[PDB]
């Protein structure tokens, strides 16, 4: 991934391909061939989860050489995964949705902490914990 002239952060849908009213010309204004991106990403969908708002970090080079950097889905949508309650903020502090624990959430935090940018893996889960009541969730303790 090069510097920012065509550098974007994208991928509303991971399990769904080419969401043109979500993304469409969000990178098509930069004009990158996303047809080489998707079937490559279908070969990047060999191992992990499906049908989820998983983001991406895309920068291309000068001569159509393309590059994606995907990560784990955001901590605001990590609450909908390990808990099974696909809702969020709206107005979160008086929105009651549900509650799972630090010991339930940490199973998918066993993988993503190296995928995230930190050295404290006990505190990169706290990037979901303070996100939780910012998306209307409680944490079991």
């Amino acid at each position: 991934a090069k510097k920012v002239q065509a550098y974007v952060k994208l991928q509303v849908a991971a399990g769904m391909a080419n969401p043109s009213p979500p993304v469409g010309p969000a990178l098509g204004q930069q004009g990158v061939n996303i047809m080489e991106f998707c079937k490559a990403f279908n070969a990047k969908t060999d191992s992990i989860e499906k049908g989820l708002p998983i983001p991406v970090v895309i920068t291309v080079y000068a001569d159509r050489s393309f590059t994606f950097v995907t990560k784990t889905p955001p901590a605001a949508v990590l609450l909908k995964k390990a808990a099974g309650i696909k809702s969020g903020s709206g107005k979160p502090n008086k929105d009651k949705v549900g509650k799972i624990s630090r010991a339930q959430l940490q199973e998918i935090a066993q993988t993503k902490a190296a995928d995230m940018t930190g050295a404290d893996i006990e505190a990169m889960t706290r990037s979901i914990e303070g996100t939780a009541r910012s998306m209307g969730l409680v944490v079991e303790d």
Binding site: T117, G118, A119, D120
Partner: protein, 131 residues
Amino acid sequence: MALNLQDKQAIVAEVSEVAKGALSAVVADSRGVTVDKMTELRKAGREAGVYMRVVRNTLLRRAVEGTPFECLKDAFVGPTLIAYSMEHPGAAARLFKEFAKANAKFEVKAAAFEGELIPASQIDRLATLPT
């Protein structure tokens, strides 16, 4: 910043840890970006953790006030961009010529780092490491 002791609570915290430490270096970034700090303290994130210091307080009487407490000869390091690299674990530890890689790595000039106390020398490459 706050009042007098709050300006100097880190200056009495400057030398409390290098009272049991002995060696350090110099880093600065007049071009490098946050991914330098995010990953060269991930270098600290694999060495010890957080408090491998990258503090930038070499103002003309700020670290110079913290200088006569410990390692008296570093009063001439008062001019332009200097950050003190505090490391305890290991006599002549890992972070000794990985700064020489950092001359190439992403922080294009590292403020002409050279290393000050206990090689008993200025400029001389730091290569005699007890691993």
